[PDB]
């Protein structure tokens, strides 16, 4: 667009060092006399802080003396003393000054943790202090004399410096002396010099400070500042309306010490200028400048002096610092944000009759919340004369004003936000309905998302006064605008319990029902058929329902069908919107189905049809809920007397096992688990008791003997509707409750035999007592941590905004279904569902592209993905997104609180936080293959030996289950030297252990057949003769490397494979000798002469998941025993035995030689020293380091491992947060990058990755060929992300003010008010969302043209 001639908004903000001359630009008057008293009579003396000549009119266009009591007089001054009459309100902006007669330094920039002035002049802060406290003289403009320019000279020594050098020599102390030094700083000479020596100095204590100084010096260049601008000659003065002085009843003063400090700043100040006209000696008038700078300190707090108190009163004087900021940032942007206007805080109530788009609000609250509108409306129409006359009408609550109240309520959007709201799903918009009551009524089918129940949930009502807020209501916050969860595309509101049962008793089938068999030509008369009740609600009746189908692209072709259907579901159709198929409502109703029904109604029919349909459901949900009269009392429950029959069985066995212990067969622990198992199986029998009983035991005479129908038990209905019927709870209620945990965290082997319906004893209570305790404790604390969890999430992604569409990258990461263990859990589909395809993807069929590069993958395209057998597809990731400081839509997707294209203006950082932080409260041998498919041996080198056992000789044993389709269903990692019953390309059934191994043995087997000769393996040197007491067959048990011999710790037990000649049989593929080294603690299953088959035993070696681990995931803690990965591709070997560490010399065969690691060998090393490993093979065993996989294999590698690691965490938690939210989170973690190569920046400086991304973008381009510094992605923790805040106004908020203030103040680095938290502090529209195009206007008018 075009910049306007009009002055609309105040543009993006700047902040940088200025000139005291520009402070003279605020020359309204000079503050002289602080005392505003006649020095007796309390006469309000002008000529000071409170003056009209120095500042302005006491009142609007009002002169000091009163010569101008005309609010027409503007400009004309009081000719006695210049009183230019203007509005007194502007005195909240009256800036004055005082011409100091003193060059003053800055002790604040001195004692700041980071000695700013020290690293500024490159002079030890120690000597700098000796200079500013006026105890010694610094040499100025001399330098090439007795001493150097950056040195001091005490009083005694300066006298010596004079006796030797009066010639070409001067050296004063303090600010004036340093003014000379700042007046002479040689910035860029030093710049050339500091990089020269950045390549010269090669010591840590040296170049550390080198890169330090060089950095900030070119930073001064970055702004163009010349150090002089820190030495104040001018003293700025605040607007009068910023320091109160009020009389106290009696004859005293209740003044805020703001005055009593500026008075001090000036008492001392004028005394100083006096002391200079008097020309007093140095150290005395300089001790005066000490008091001048402490006056400055008196304004901050007192700087870092000693907490200056006042005469006979302990009181560290008025701290401006703390008074604009404070805690949690400031006292507005903190929990301290006052009790909002246009608000109403009270508890809530239901309200069935409350329509979809509306809520119910109390008349009384309505009065208190709509007055101004009524006042403006009463004097607008003419039913009140003045606003005060309007007050009187509402003073009596005239029926008239209620109609005017009506006018300002009819279509007035309202915002509803609860207090316990931690996630955005607690904020919506509605429409008012006049309610005569006290509690705020709410629409039922929304409360589930609110998690707002009926106990004491107080919702605050916030009036959208401006049309913008009103439009925001009916734009994104409307009730009908918050249908899906912004974590996953499902229509979040699923019928909870009451409404579910309503529709459950509606659509249901049975065998006996009045009228079962007749025919109707319409569901409409079917309505008038049951509302009368001339037939039962579950009779199979032929009614002609006209189901529809969007056979076209919007034209729903009609298909009239006849259905022998139950009366209830027939009535259900009159509610069902056309397009939806009758097949979805031809079931016995399921809760999962009932939610995804609206999801498919959203897919097929769209938004509108789904919305209005949902409301219809709610009204009939209550309707037929009442028709059910679904009651349950003592006499309606049923208990199997087969329950106490299974208990009889359960009795026998345990009695006998305790008696086995009385003799001494099973041990205590053996008996322990034994007991547990039989009682658990007993409960499953009690299950197969009460479950089948209450499943279909009701048989009714109908068209035959007695045809059974599914039992209409209320319990059964809840248990099948899905509403609230959880057969597990129910079965601890009607069947044996079971074994409850114990105070230890284990299990009391005693079950709660006597069920709830029946008796319970004090014994059973105390078992379950730990349970009660347990529950409470955990949630009561998880709550608090979840809040700080979301705190750290906001911490990490504040500034991320989607602000582009397509960029220029043809990259992302590989999306793959988490095929692990048995069943294929997360599909390829449900990950990519709602994302944008990266590349042109081919089909399992070759050279036939099914999904072109840039394609929005939705339901149908995902159905398209599942028509063939495509298993792996790449999607453009946001961590690979080439968008600089932001994300593009073609790298994000569409899965949001809607199903459409993510738009520019969507600040995604924080919405990710909430969506992901929400689940905090819900956090905590011989494998037979059960999946029926084809056993596919991938990359594993197995071999057939004697007995046909397909033994394993490689660690990468990835077993796959390539099915009839080809898509892997099951995956199993088989250990070393294990048996494989079947091979690659041979189908097996479900229930055969082909993945058969022994966890107690890791046999060392050969690959080919050959003899074994024990080389350097004699008893006493390397091996011991541990031919046991059970097995006398020759075995040479290898002693480990510490039990062998002194000089035996350099001798290796090598097994040499030779034939009947003495020749060595080489290893398949290379020319290397097959010299397998028998490891430590190995039960050698062979002697000298035993021919090892193609895989026979030669040696025998035996051996949180919730908030906690995920928290450490955020700080990326290097573990206890970190599993190290193979650094480079190539051979690995040993060197230098245990001296504490051990040389793991990994020498490349295709890389660079010198690589060798230091590892303590207290770990179990699985080092394949005979093999040529690859960069990534686990070396030791234990937890891993995100860091390492990031810096080694790459971001993409580590990134999807962790998001899939956590994908398993939340998998068993039962929650599905959007992985795309998680993707952006991780990019922000690696926000900074520690550079590796040298170029135009630093050799190792941890700098912005995207800034460096634009660096190389134009390093490849012009002004260079290729000098560009190539970085290494640095992984930062969350308290490091919050520590690396570019918004100093944000770090200062919760971190050390002084620190961060000076931290940016050195160069006065401009925060263009570009971001999020800056828009909080200033109170303006962020550059996104509503203010997106708003700031387009603003940015087009700032720092550019």
């Amino acid at each position: 667009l075009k910049a306007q001639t009009k002055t609309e908004e105040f543009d993006a903000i700047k902040i940088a060092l200025a000139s005291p001359d520009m402070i003279r630009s605020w020359s309204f008057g000079e503050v002289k006399k602080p005392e505003t008293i006649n020095y007796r009579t309390f006469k309000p003396e002008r000529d000071g802080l409170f003056c009209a000549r120095i500042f302005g009119p006491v009142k609007d266009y009002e002169c000091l003396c009163g010569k101008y009591k005309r609010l027409k007089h503007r400009g004309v001054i009081c000719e006695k003393c210049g009183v230019e009459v203007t509005q007194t309100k502007v005195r909240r902006e009256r800036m004055g000054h005082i011409e100091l007669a003193s060059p003053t330094a800055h002790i604040w920039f001195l004692k700041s943790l980071p000695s700013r002035i020290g690293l500024l002049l490159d002079m030890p802060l120690r000597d700098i202090e000796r200079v500013l406290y006026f105890e010694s003289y610094v040499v100025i403009e001399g330098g090439m004399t007795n001493l150097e320019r950056q040195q001091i000279l005490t009083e005694e020594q300066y006298l010596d410096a004079l006796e030797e050098f009066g010639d070409e020599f001067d050296a004063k102390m303090g600010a004036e002396a340093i003014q000379a030094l700042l007046k002479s700083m040689d910035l860029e000479q030093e710049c050339e010099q500091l990089r020269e020596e950045l390549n010269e100095t090669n010591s840590e204590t040296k170049r550390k400070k080198l890169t330090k100084r060089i950095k900030l010096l070119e930073a001064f260049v970055q702004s163009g500042n010349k150090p002089e601008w820190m030495i104040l000659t001018v003293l700025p003065v605040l607007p009068p309306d910023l320091r109160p002085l009020v009389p106290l009843d009696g004859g005293r003063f209740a003044t805020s010490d703001l005055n009593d400090l500026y008075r001090r700043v000036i008492n001392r100040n004028n005394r100083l200028k006096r002391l200079l006209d008097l020309a007093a000696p140095d150290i005395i008038v300089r001790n005066e400048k000490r008091m001048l700078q402490e006056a400055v300190d008196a304004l901050l707090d007192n700087g870092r002096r000693g907490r200056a108190i006042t005469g006979s009163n302990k009181r560290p004087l008025k701290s401006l610092a703390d008074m604009i900021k404070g805690k949690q940032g400031r006292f507005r942007q903190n929990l301290l944000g006052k009790r909002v206007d246009y608000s109403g805080r009270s508890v809530i109530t239901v309200g069935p009759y409350l329509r979809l788009h509306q809520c119910g609000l109390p008349k009384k609250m309505a009065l208190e919340l709509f007055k101004p509108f009524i006042y403006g409306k009463l004097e607008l129409r003419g039913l009140a004369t003045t606003i005060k006359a309007a007050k009187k009408m509402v003073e009596r609550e005239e029926a008239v004003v209620w109609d005017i109240l009506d006018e300002v309520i009819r279509e007035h959007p309202v915002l509803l936000n609860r207090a316990p709201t931690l996630h955005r799903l607690g904020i919506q918009a509605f429409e008012p309905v006049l309610i005569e009551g006290k509690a705020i009524q709410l629409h039922p089918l929304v409360c589930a998302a609110y998690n707002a129940d009926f106990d004491g949930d107080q919702m605050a009502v916030h009036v959208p006064l401006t049309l913008e807020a009103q439009l925001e209501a009916r734009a994104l916050m409307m009730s009908t605008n918050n249908i899906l969860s912004p974590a996953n595309g499902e229509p979040i509101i699923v019928p909870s319990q009451d409404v579910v049962l309503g529709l459950y008793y509606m659509t249901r089938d049975c065998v006996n029902a009045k009228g079962e068999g007749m025919v109707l030509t319409g569901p409409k008369e079917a309505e008038r058929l049951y509302r009368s009740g001339l037939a039962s609600l579950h009779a199979r009746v032929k009614v002609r329902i006209t189901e529809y189908e969007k056979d076209a692209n919007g034209e729903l072709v009609a298909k009239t069908s006849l259905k022998d259907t139950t009366v209830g579901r027939a009535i259900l159709w009159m509610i069902v919107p056309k397009g939806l198929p009758y097949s979805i409502v031809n079931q016995a109703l399921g809760k999962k189905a009932i939610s995804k029904m609206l999801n498919t109604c959203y897919r097929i029919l769209g938004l509108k049809p789904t919305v209005i349909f949902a409301d219809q459901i709610m009204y009939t949900g209550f309707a037929y809920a009442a028709r059910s009269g679904a009651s349950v009392g003592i006499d309606d429950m049923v208990i199997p007397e087969k329950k106490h029959e299974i208990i009889s069985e359960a009795e026998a066995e345990v009695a006998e096992i305790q008696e086995q212990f009385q003799s001494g067969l099973v041990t205590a622990g053996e008996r322990y688990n034994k007991v547990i198992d039989i009682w658990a199986a007993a409960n499953d029998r009690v299950s197969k008791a009460m479950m089948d009983n209450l499943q279909t035991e009701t048989v009714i005479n109908r068209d035959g003997q007695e045809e059974k129908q599914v039992s209409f038990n209320s319990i059964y209905m809840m248990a099948d509707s899905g509403a609230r019927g959880s057969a597990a709870q129910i079965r601890q209620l009607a069947g044996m409750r079971g074994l409850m945990a114990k105070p230890d965290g284990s299990i009391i082997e005693t079950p709660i035999t006597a069920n709830f319906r029946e008796g319970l004893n004090v014994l059973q209570y105390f078992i379950s007592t730990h349970g009660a305790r347990k529950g409470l404790a955990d949630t009561a604390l998880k709550t608090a941590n979840s809040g700080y969890l979301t705190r750290r999430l906001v911490d990490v992604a504040q500034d991320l905004v989607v602000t582009e569409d397509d960029c220029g990258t043809h990259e992302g990461i590989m999306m793959t279904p988490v095929i692990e263990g048995g069943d294929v859990k997360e599909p390829l589909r449900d990950r990519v569902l709602g994302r944008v395809t990266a590349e042109d993807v081919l089909k399992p069929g070759t050279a036939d592209i099914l999904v072109p590069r840039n394609t929005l993958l939705h339901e149908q395209w995902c159905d398209l993905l599942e028509e063939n057998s495509v298993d792996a597809v790449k999607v453009r990731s946001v961590v690979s997104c080439d968008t600089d400081f932001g994300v593009c839509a073609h790298c994000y997707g569409r899965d949001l609180a809607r199903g459409h294209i993510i738009n520019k203006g969507e600040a995604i950082g924080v919405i990710a936080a909430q969506s992901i932080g929400e689940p905090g409260t819900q956090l905590t041998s011989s494998i037979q293959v059960k999946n029926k498919g084809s056993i596919k041996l991938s990359n594993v080198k197995s071999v057939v030996n004697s007995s046909g056992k397909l033994v394993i000789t490689s660690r990468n044993t990835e077993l796959k289950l390539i099915d009839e389709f080809g898509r892997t269903k099951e995956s199993y990692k088989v250990p070393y030297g294990a048996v494989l019953a079947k091979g690659d390309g041979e189908q097996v059934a479900g229930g055969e252990t082909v993945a058969n191994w022994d966890p107690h043995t890791m046999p060392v087997i050969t690959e080919v057949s050959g003899f074994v000769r024990f080389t350097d393996m004699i008893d006493g040197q390397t091996i011991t003769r541990q031919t046991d007491e059970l097995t006398g067959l020759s075995s040479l048990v290898v002693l480990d490397s510490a039990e062998r011999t002194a000089g035996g710790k350099d001798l290796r037990p090598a097994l040499k494979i030779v034939d009947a000649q003495g020749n060595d049989v080489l290893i398949p593929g290379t020319d290397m000798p097959a010299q397998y080294f028998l490891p430590g603690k190995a039960i050698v299953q062979l002697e000298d002469g035993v021919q090892i088959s193609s895989g026979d035993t030669l040696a025998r070696i035996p051996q949180t998941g919730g908030l906690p681990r995920v928290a450490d995931l955020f700080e990326a803690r290097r573990p206890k025993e970190p599993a190290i990965l193979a650094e480079i591709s190539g051979i690995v070997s040993f060197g230098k035995e245990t001296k504490g560490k051990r040389r793991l010399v990994i020498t490349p065969v295709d890389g660079s030689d010198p690589y060798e690691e230091m590892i303590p060998k207290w770990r179990q090393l699985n080092v394949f020293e005979g093999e040529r490993v690859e960069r990534g093979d686990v070396i030791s065993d234990g937890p891993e380091a995100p860091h390492d996989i990031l810096r080694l294999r790459g971001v993409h590698a580590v990134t999807r491992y962790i998001v899939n690691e956590v994908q398993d965490v939340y998998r068993l938690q039962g929650v599905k947060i959007n992985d795309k939210h998680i993707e952006v989170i991780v990019r922000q973690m690696l926000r900074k990058a520690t550079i590796v190569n040298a170029g135009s920046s630093d050799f190792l400086e941890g700098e912005q990755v995207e800034y460096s991304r634009v660096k190389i973008a134009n390093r490849e381009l012009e002004a260079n060929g290729k000098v560009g510094a190539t970085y290494s992605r640095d992984l930062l923790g969350i308290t490091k992300a919050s520590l690396a805040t570019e918004s100093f106004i944000s770090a200062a908020s919760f971190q050390e003010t002084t620190r961060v203030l000076t931290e940016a103040a050195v160069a006065g680095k401009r925060d263009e008010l570009r971001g999020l938290k800056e828009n909080v502090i200033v109170g303006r529209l962020i550059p996104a969302g509503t203010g997106y195009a708003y700031h387009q206007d603003r940015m087009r008018r700032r720092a550019a043209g």
């Binding site: 279509e411 049309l467 009103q470 439009l471 009916r474 708003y1334």
Partner: protein
């Protein structure tokens, strides 16, 4: 009443810029600067602006035209 705003998405689907634009139009309706063209159904200005955008008669294009049109009317 209004069931959805998906029809506003059919014309101007920014979801946020919508808020900005029509809101300013509603304010010219407040201050006697102007008056509506689409008859209100007791709907106060917020809901009226919604109707105007869904039909697509008064969108961002037309509003800027109105801006420059007033410029010829105030200048001359």
């Amino acid at each position: 009443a209004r069931v959805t705003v998906q029809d506003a998405v059919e014309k101007i689907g920014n979801r946020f810029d919508l808020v900005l634009v029509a809101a300013r139009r509603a304010r010219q309706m407040q201050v006697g600067g102007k008056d509506p063209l689409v008859p209100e159904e007791n709907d106060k200005t917020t809901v009226i602006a919604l109707r105007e955008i869904e039909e697509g008669l008064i969108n961002n294009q037309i509003l800027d035209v109105r801006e420059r049109q007033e410029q010829q009317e105030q200048e001359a």
